[PDB]
C-alpha cells in the first residue's frame, strides 16, 4: 500500500522479501528440551549441524 | 438491502444463464507445474474473477488502481477475492434432463400432474419404453406407452403424424403442449 | 430370439436402474455373423462410397472448385504445407510435382474437352453424355483423401440445404396463401423447370378458389428470382441435380445403415475388451463409451482389402482410445500422455527393482538406471499423488470429517487490517498537520487517498513545469518527516 | 487448497462436476458424429445418472 511505501521511503531500511515461518513455542508452555532430532534425505547434506 | 420475505419458486433457464458470467466447457482444474486455472476450466479466472487480491492471472496487472480492466492476454477482471463467493457458473447441455428430485420425491408431483404412476415415468425416462406425446389419429392418444416392438409395428403403418420421443424430450413436449385451464375445467 | 428376451426382461425388471443391464439388453439382441457379415457390410460401404463418387463426378462444380483451389495453391510456385496431403493423391490399383502433373494432364484435357461440348445441341447431347460418362469413369479411379473430402461433402450439403430451403419457402408462400394442391404444383414445376409458363397456365385455368392471387403475384416472382439466380450461378439442369441429390442421399443412408449394423455387431467385442480391461478408473460406462467411440473411428477407416480380421484393428483402436481417456480423464488434475507413459515406465522399473532387492527404490539408483537426472525423478514422485478427499475422517470414529480442518490463510486477519487502518490514519493526520502543498505533493507522488500514483513528470505537468522544484519539495517533505519530534510516533511502525 | 502434508485436498463435488462435464462432452461428440441409436440411448442414460 502507498502508506507502507511512504514509510519505507522515510525509514530507508532494506526490508528484504523473506518470510518468517519459524517454529515457536505454544503459549503457556515453559519447559526444557531433552534432545533434538534432525532428519534429512540422501541428497541434502548434513550442513555441519547433524 | 433489508429483505422482507423469503420466496421460493422454480428457476428459469434464461435466468440461470443471466446469473452466470461465463460457460464452463473443459473440466481441467489446474496444471501440474503452475497452480493457475485453465482459461476454460472449472474455477477459471476469466469466468469467476481473480484468485488473489486484485491480481490478474499472469501477474501483469499490478497497481490495484486498475479496476475493471479486461486483459488482452489472460482476460481477468481485477477485483477482490470475495467476488468468487457471490457468483456462479453454468453448463450448456446438449440433451435436456429430467429433474430427479421432482419425480422421486413423494408424492411424485410429476406423476400427479401428468396422471401417471411412478413406474411408467421411470420406464420412460430410463429409455426402456417409448411414450406417445400427442396422437392426431384415432388410434392412440396422449399418455400411451409402447415397447420397442410395438413402436416398430406402429411406425411402419403410419407416418408424419405419430409424435413420440425418448424420455426427457417427450416429457418436455407433453408439458409444453398440455393446457392447464382445460384440464382444470375437466376435473 | 429377440421379442421374447425383451418381454422377459421387461417383466422381470422390478424398477431396476442398473445401466449395465440395460446396455447388455440393448446389445444382446443383435447376433454375430462371422466371416460372412463384416465382408458384406464392407462391400456395401464401398458400394455406397462408389455411388457418392459417381454422384460427385456427375456434379462438375466440385471438380471445378477443386481445380480452382489447386490453381490458387500453385500460383505462388512455392507451397509445401499440409494442404497438399489433403488433395486427391490417387493410388496405383513420396509426393512429387512430376507425378501430380502427369496425373492431372489427362484430367485437365478431359475437362477442357467436355467444357467445349456443353453448347453442342444442349446439355443432354449424346457426345456430351459419353464425355461425361468417360470423365466419371476416370474420376472413379481416384481415391480422395478425407481431409478435403469432408470439406467438399460439407459444401455439397450446404448447397443442397439451401436449395431445399428455397423450395420449401416457395411451397409455403404458395400453400399458406392460395391453398394450392401439391400434385398440380410439383408436377408442373418438375415438367417446366424453365420459366413461369405453368403460372400462366394456372391463370388461364378457371380455378374459382385461386381468385385471391393478385396480392401474392408480386411476391411469387420475387421469390422465384432467387431460384433463377441460383440456376444462373450453377448452370445445370434441375432434374439432374435432384437425381444426384437423391442418389447421394440413398448412398449415405445405406452407409449409415451398414455402419449401425457393424456397430451393433461389434458391441459384444467392445464389451469383451472392456471386461479384459476391467480397471475401476472413472467408471465402466465411460470405458464402454470410449471403446464404442474407438470402434466407430476404426470403422470409419477400416477396409477389407488387407485380408485380415477386423478384430485386431478394432482392439488396437479401442486400446488406444482407452489409454488416451485414462491419461486425460479419470483424474482430478490433467496429466499429459507423455507424463503418464513416463510414470508407467518408472513404475515398471521400480517393480523389478523391488523384486530384485526387496526395498523401496531409491531415487539415485532409479535415476542411474533411467539415465536421467534426479530432479526429474523427484518431480515425478512429488506430482504423482492422488488428491485426498474432503470428507475423510481424521480419526477412527466417523464423528468429525475433514470439513473444517484447514485454516483460511488466503484473506487477512483483523489484526493486520486494524494495523493498516491505524497506520493510514496516522499518516493522514501527519499530512494534515504539515503544509498544504507538501501534503498534496506527497499524496500525488505515493498515492495516499488517491487512485492513481503519479510520477515526477506527471506531478510536474499538473503543478509546475519545473520538475526540479517538485523534487526539492519532495526531498524537503521527506527531511521534515524524518525529524525525531515528528517521527517519535511513526517509529512504532518500524516492524510493520 | 494444498494440505500441510505437501499433498492436495480435492472435493467430491469437483469430481461430480468433472464427471458431468465429461459425459456432456461425450454426448456432444456422439451427436456431432451421428452415433447409433443404442450408443445415444446409453449416453443419455449415463448423463441422466450423472
Give the Cα separation of C366 and C373 in Å (integer).
10
Which of B29, B63, B126 comes nearest C22 by C-beta? Answer: B126
Rounded Cα distance between C210 and D17, Å, is 61
Residue in B closest to D46 by C-alpha: B126
Q: What's the burial of C154, exposed, middle or buried (CB within 10 Å: 0-12/13-18/19+)?
A: exposed
Q: Are C294 and C320 in contact (CB under 8 A)?
A: yes
- Any residues with CB less than 8 A from the CB of C404 and at least 6 apart, and which? none
Closest CA to D6 of C238, C381, C248: C381
Asked whether B147 and C10 are in contact (CB, 8 A), the reply is yes
Query: Residue C447: which region, alpha, beta or left (left: phi > 0; alpha: psi -120 to 50)?
Result: left
Window 11-50 of D, Cβ < 8 Å to B? 14, 17-18, 20-22, 24-25, 27-28, 31, 41, 44-45, 47-48
How many alpha carbons lie under 13 Å from residue D37 in its C-beta half-sphere?
Answer: 10
Residues C391, C394, C398, CA angle at the centre, nearest 5°? 70
**Under an 8 A CB cutoff, do B28 and C3 touch?**
no
> Would the CB atoms of A2 and C420 count as touching at under 8 Å?
no
First to last CA, chain C: 84
| Phi, psi values for residue B173, rounded to 5° | -65, -35
Q: Cell numbers of B98, please?
A: 429430467
Per CB-CB distance under 8 Å, the chain C contacts of A13 are 494
Q: Nearest CB to C292: which of D3, D12, D39?
A: D39
C441 Cβ neighbours under 8 A, 6+ residues apart: C459, C463, C470, C473, C474, C477
**What is the helix (H) or strand (E) element at residue B134, kind and residue range?**
strand B130-135
* Feature table: binding site of B: 56, 58, 71, 74
| Residue C444 cell numbers, joined | 500525488
> Residue-wise over C302-332: b if at least 16 C-beta within 10 A, else e?
bebeeeeebeebbbebbeebbbebbbbbbbb
* Grid cell for residue C101: 502433373
Supply the Cα-derived Rg of chain A in whole angstroms. Answer: 19
Cα distance between residue C405 and residue D1, in whole Å: 12
DSSP 8-state code for residue B139: S
Alpha-carbon gap, residue D8 to D14, rounded angstroms? 13
Q: How far apart are CA C42 and CA C33, in angstroms?
A: 13
The answer, for D39 touching chain C at a CB cutoff of 8 Å, is: yes
Contacts of B29 in chain C (CB under 8 A): 332-334
Chosen for mutation from D30, D36, D37, D49 (greatest number of chain C CBs closer than 10 Å) is: D36
Reference C178, options C123, C220, C231; nearest CA is C220
**C383 contacts in B (CB within 8 Å)?**
32
C293–D29: do the CB atoms touch at under 8 Å? yes
Return the C-alpha cell found at C46: 464401398
Round the CA-based radius of gyration of chain B to a whole number and report it: 24
Q: Rounded to an integer, what distance in angstroms lies between the CA atom of residue D42 and that of residue C23?
A: 7
Q: How many CA atoms are closer than 13 Å to the CA of C165, on its beta-carbon side?
A: 8
Pairwise CA distance, residues C136 & C242, whole Å: 18
Q: Residue C496: name the closest of C429, C419, C421 by CA.
A: C419
C155 — alpha (psi -120 to 50), left (phi > 0) or beta?
alpha
Contacts of C301 (CB under 8 A, 6+ apart): none
CB C281 within 8 A of CB C44: no
Minimal Cα distance from B25: which residue of D?
D21
Please, which residues have CB within 8 angstroms of residue C79's CB and are 6 or more apart in sequence?
C73
Spatial separation of the C-alpha atoms in residues C17 and B118, rounded to whole Å:
13
Phi-psi map region of A13: left, alpha, beta (phi>0 left; psi -120 to 50 alpha) = beta
Q: Which residues pair with D2 in a beta bridge?
A: D8
Q: Which residues of chain B have a Cβ shorter than 8 Å from any chain C Cβ? A: 27-32, 53, 63, 65, 81, 119, 122, 126-129, 147-149
Cell digits of residue C50: 462408389
Rounded Cα distance, C452 and B64, in Å: 9
User: B148 to chain C: which residues are within 8 Å by CB?
Assistant: 6
User: Minimal Cα distance from B119: which residue of C?
Assistant: C15
Q: Do chains A and D touch (3 or more CB pairs under 8 A)?
A: no
Q: Give the closest residue to C384 by CA, choosing from B19, B180, D8.
A: D8
Q: How far is CA C276 from CA C260, C266, C299, C329, in A?
A: 24, 15, 21, 20
* Contacting subunits of D (3+ beta carbon pairs below 8 A): B, C
> What distance in Å separates the CA atoms of residue B54 and residue B45, rounded to the nearest whole number?
12
Neighbouring chains of C at 3+ CB pairs under 8 Å are A, B, D
Our CA angle for C14, C18, C22, nearest 5°, is 90
Q: Is C174 exposed, middle or buried (0-12, 13-18, 19+ CB in 10 A)?
A: middle
Residue showing cell 490458387: C72
Write out chain C residues lying below 8 Å of A14, CB-based: none
User: Which chain B positions have a beta carbon within 8 Å of C330's beta carbon?
Assistant: none
Spatial neighbors of A42 by CB under 8 A, at least 6 apart, are C362, C363, C364
- Interface contact C490, partner D, CB < 8 A: no
Q: How many CB pairs under 8 A join B and D?
A: 42
Amino acid at each position: 500500500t502507498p502508506e507502507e511505501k511512504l514509510l519505507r521511503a522515510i525509514f530507508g531500511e532494506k526490508a528484504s522479501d523473506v518470510k518468517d515461518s519459524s517454529l515457536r513455542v505454544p503459549n503457556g508452555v515453559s519447559g526444557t528440551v531433552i534432545d533434538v532430532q534432525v532428519f534429512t534425505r540422501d541428497g541434502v547434506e548434513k550442513d555441519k549441524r547433524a | 438491502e433489508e429483505f422482507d420475505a423469503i420466496k421460493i419458486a422454480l428457476a428459469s433457464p434464461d435466468m440461470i444463464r443471466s446469473w452466470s458470467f461465463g460457460e464452463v466447457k473443459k473440466p481441467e482444474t489446474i496444471n501440474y507445474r503452475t497452480f493457475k486455472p485453465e482459461r476454460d476450466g472449472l474455477f477459471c479466472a476469466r469466468i469467476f474473477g481473480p484468485v488473489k487480491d486484485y491480481e490478474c492471472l499472469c501477474g501483469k496487472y499490478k497497481r490495484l488502481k486498475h479496476r475493471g480492466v479486461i486483459c488482452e492476454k489472460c482476460g481477468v477482471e481485477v477485483t477482490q477475492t470475495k467476488v468468487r463467493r457471490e457468483r456462479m457458473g453454468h453448463i450448456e447441455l446438449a440433451s435436456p434432463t429430467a429433474h430427479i428430485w421432482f419425480l422421486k420425491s413423494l408424492p411424485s408431483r410429476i406423476g400427479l400432474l401428468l396422471d401417471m404412476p411412478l413406474r411408467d415415468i421411470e420406464r420412460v425416462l430410463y429409455f426402456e419404453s417409448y411414450v406417445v406425446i400427442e396422437g392426431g389419429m384415432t388410434n392412440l392418444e396422449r399418455q400411451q406407452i409402447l415397447t420397442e416392438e410395438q413402436y416398430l409395428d406402429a411406425l411402419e403403418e403410419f407416418g408424419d403424424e405419430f409424435d413420440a420421443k425418448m424420455g426427457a424430450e417427450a416429457i418436455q413436449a407433453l408439458l409444453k403442449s398440455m393446457d392447464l385451464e382445460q384440464e382444470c375445467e375437466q376435473l | 430370439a429377440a421379442a421374447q428376451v425383451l418381454s422377459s426382461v421387461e417383466s422381470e425388471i422390478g424398477r431396476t436402474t442398473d445401466p449395465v443391464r440395460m446396455y447388455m439388453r440393448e446389445m444382446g439382441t443383435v447376433e454375430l455373423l462371422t466371416r460372412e457379415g463384416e465382408i458384406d457390410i464392407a462391400k456395401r460401404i464401398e458400394d455406397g462410397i462408389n455411388q457418392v463418387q459417381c454422384s460427385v463426378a456427375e456434379y462438375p462444380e466440385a471438380i471445378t472448385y477443386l481445380l480452382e483451389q489447386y490453381d490458387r495453391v500453385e500460383a505462388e510456385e512455392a507451397r509445401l504445407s499440409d494442404l497438399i496431403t489433403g488433395f486427391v493423391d490417387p493410388n496405383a490399383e513420396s509426393i512429387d510435382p512430376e507425378l501430380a502433373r502427369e496425373k492431372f494432364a489427362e484430367l485437365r484435357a478431359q475437362y477442357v474437352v467436355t467444357r467445349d461440348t456443353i453448347k453442342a445441341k444442349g446439355r443432354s447431347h449424346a457426345t456430351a453424355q459419353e464425355e461425361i460418362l468417360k470423365l466419371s469413369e476416370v474420376f472413379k479411379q481416384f481415391r480422395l483423401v478425407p481431409k478435403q473430402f469432408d470439406y467438399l461433402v460439407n459444401s455439397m450439403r450446404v448447397m443442397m440445404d439451401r436449395v431445399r430451403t428455397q423450395e420449401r419457402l416457395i411451397m409455403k408462400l404458395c400453400v399458406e396463401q392460395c391453398k394450392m394442391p401439391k400434385k398440380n404444383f410439383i408436377t408442373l414445376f418438375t415438367g417446366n423447370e424453365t420459366s413461369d409458363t405453368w403460372f400462366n397456365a394456372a391463370i388461364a385455368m378457371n380455378k374459382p378458389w385461386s381468385e385471391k392471387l393478385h396480392d401474392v403475384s408480386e411476391e411469387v416472382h420475387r421469390a422465384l428470382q432467387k431460384l433463377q439466380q441460383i440456376e444462373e450461378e450453377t448452370g445445370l439442369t434441375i432434374e439432374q441435380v435432384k437425381d444426384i441429390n437423391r442418389r447421394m442421399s440413398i448412398g449415405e443412408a445405406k452407409a449409415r445403415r451398414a455402419k449401425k449394423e457393424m456397430v451393433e455387431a461389434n458391441l459384444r467385442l467392445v464389451i469383451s475388451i472392456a471386461k479384459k480391461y476391467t480397471n475401476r478408473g472413472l467408471q465402466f460406462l465411460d470405458l464402454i463409451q470410449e471403446g464404442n467411440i474407438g470402434l466407430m473411428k476404426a470403422v470409419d477407416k477400416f477396409e477389407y482389402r488387407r485380408g485380415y480380421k477386423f478384430s485386431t484393428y478394432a482392439t488396437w483402436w479401442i486400446r488406444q482410445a482407452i489409454t488416451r481417456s485414462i491419461a486425460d480423464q479419470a483424474r482430478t488434475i490433467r496429466i499429459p500422455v507423455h507424463m503418464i507413459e513416463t510414470i508407467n515406465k518408472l513404475n515398471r522399473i521400480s517393480r523389478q527393482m523391488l523384486q530384485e532387492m526387496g526395498r523401496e527404490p531409491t531415487p539415485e539408483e532409479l535415476a542411474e538406471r533411467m539415465l536421467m537426472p534426479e530432479d526429474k525423478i523427484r518431480k515425478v514422485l512429488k506430482i504423482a499423488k492422488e488428491p485426498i478427499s474432503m470428507e475423510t475422517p481424521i480419526g477412527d470414529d466417523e464423528d468429525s470429517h475433514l470439513g473444517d480442518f484447514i485454516e483460511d490463510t488466503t484473506l487477512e486477519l483483523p489484526l493486520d487490517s486494524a494495523t493498516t487502518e491505524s497506520l493510514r490514519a496516522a499518516t493522514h493526520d501527519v499530512l494534515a498537520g504539515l503544509t498544504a502543498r507538501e501534503a498534496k505533493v506527497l499524496r500525488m507522488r505515493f498515492g495516499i487517498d488517491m487512485n492513481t500514483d503519479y510520477t515526477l513528470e506527471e506531478v510536474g505537468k499538473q503543478f509546475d513545469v519545473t520538475r526540479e522544484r517538485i523534487r526539492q519539495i519532495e526531498a524537503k517533505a521527506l527531511r521534515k518527516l524524518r525529524h525525531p519530534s515528528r517521527s517519535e510516533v511513526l517509529r512504532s511502525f518500524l516492524d510493520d | 487448497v494444498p494440505l500441510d502434508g505437501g499433498r492436495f485436498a480435492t472435493s467430491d463435488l469437483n469430481d461430480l462436476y468433472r464427471r458431468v462435464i465429461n459425459r456432456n462432452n461425450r454426448l456432444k461428440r456422439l451427436l456431432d458424429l451421428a452415433a447409433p441409436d443404442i450408443i445415444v440411448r446409453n449416453e443419455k442414460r449415463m448423463l441422466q445418472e450423472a
